[PDB]
Amino acid sequence: RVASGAGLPTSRQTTIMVTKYSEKSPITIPFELSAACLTYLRETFEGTI
């Protein structure tokens, strides 16, 4: 607010409260893993090159 110099200024609340509502949105994506490669990774065998 600006200090007045001509008119008598009315008193006011210097702080106001506003309410905002939120919007919701999901995002999803699938992906797939072969079992054979998963067994390779899991079972740690290392004998041959």
28 sits near other proteins (criterion: CB under 8 A): no
- Sequence-separated (6 or more) residues with CB below 8 Å from residue 1: 9, 12, 14
If one asks whether residue 34 binds other proteins (CB under 8 A), the answer comes out as: no
Q: How far apart are CA 31 and CA 29, in angstroms?
A: 7
Cβ(1)–Cβ(15) below 8 Å: no
13 vs 48 by CB, closer to other proteins? 48
Q: Which stretch binds other proteins (CB under 8 A): 6-14, 15-23, 30-38, 41-49?
A: 41-49
Contact set with other proteins (CB under 8 A): 45, 47-48
